[PDB]
Amino acid sequence: SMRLIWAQSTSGIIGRDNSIPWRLPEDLARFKEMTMGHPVVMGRLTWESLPASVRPLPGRRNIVVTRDADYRAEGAEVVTDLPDEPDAWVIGGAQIYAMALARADRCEVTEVDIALTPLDGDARAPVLDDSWVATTGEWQTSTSGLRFRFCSYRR
Ligand SMILES: NC(=O)c1ccc[n+]([C@@H]2O[C@H](COP(=O)([O-])OP(=O)(O)OC[C@H]3O[C@@H](n4cnc5c(N)ncnc54)[C@H](OP(=O)(O)O)[C@@H]3O)[C@@H](O)[C@H]2O)c1
Ligand SMILES: CCc1nc(N)nc(N)c1OCCCOc1ccccc1CCC(=O)O
Numbered sequence: 001s002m003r004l005i006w007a008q009s010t011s012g013i014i015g016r017d018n019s020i021p022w023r024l025p026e027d028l029a030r031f032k033e034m035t036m037g038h039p040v041v042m043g044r045l046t047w048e049s050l051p052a053s054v055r056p057l058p059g060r061r062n063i064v065v066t067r068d069a070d071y072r073a074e075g076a077e078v079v080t081d082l083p084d085e086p087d088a089w090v091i092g093g094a095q096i097y098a099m100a101l102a103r104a105d106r107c108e109v110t111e112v113d114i115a116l117t118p119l120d121g122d123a124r125a126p127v128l129d130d131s132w133v134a135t136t137g138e139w140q141t142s143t144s145g146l147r148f149r150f151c152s153y154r155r
Helices: 025-035 044-049 094-101
Strands: 002-009 013-015 040-043 062-065 077-079 104-112 133-136 147-154
Touching: 002 025, 002 094, 013 094, 025 104, 025 147, 040 044, 040 094, 044 062
Parallel strands: 002 104, 040 062, 062 077
Antiparallel strands: 002 013, 104 147, 133 147
16 A cells, blocks of 8 residues: 655665765656655654755655654654555655565655665665566666666556
8 A cells, every 4th residue: 555755776775874875856856746745754864864944845744753752843743653644655764665665565766876885874775576567767867967767666
């Protein structure tokens, strides 16, 4: 029932130092069009990784998963388990993806062809296996020259 969206190095990395280690104007655009008008479900560290200007993300119901129910998240709902929201998007991070993967039938992935080598402590995308039906988009080039591609997985 759950559906997930993320961007990742082609090496598997979604986050380093509690932020994303690249800027990609096209992926920001696509993520925004996929989630706008829908609840967005995220974990506590993704919440505080947001740039202040976009905390909470505009035009969407923001839901933060945390162990502390009295946690302060101004302008977001706080919950203590993964919610069963009918139109939510699971937007990260690495812990929340691992929890959700088993209960997921859809994955919308951005891939980034970047010099990024795994480091102790990185946040990593889930491993998608031969149980998924894959739809692979062609490689594209961003203004900066960084090359990326959109992929779809369904179950
Ligand atoms: N590139 C992308 O597409 C993408 C997308 C999303 C995030 N990110 C990156 O991912 C990194 C952060 O991800 P992360 O894995 O470190 O953090 P996270 O998964 O977003 O949040 C982890 C926190 O969620 C809470 N939590 C986890 N499981 C819970 C449960 N079962 N019940 C209640 N609360 C629970 C805990 O916070 P408490 O300590 O409050 O309990 C836990 O420490 C950052 O670098 C961010 O930029 C990247
Ligand atoms: C944008 C990175 C990103 N890209 C994809 N494909 N999926 C995600 N779940 C994701 O993470 C969403 C959470 C991080 O959101 C941001 C991080 C930095 C700047 C702006 C935004 C989102 C801004 C907005 O949606 O209005």
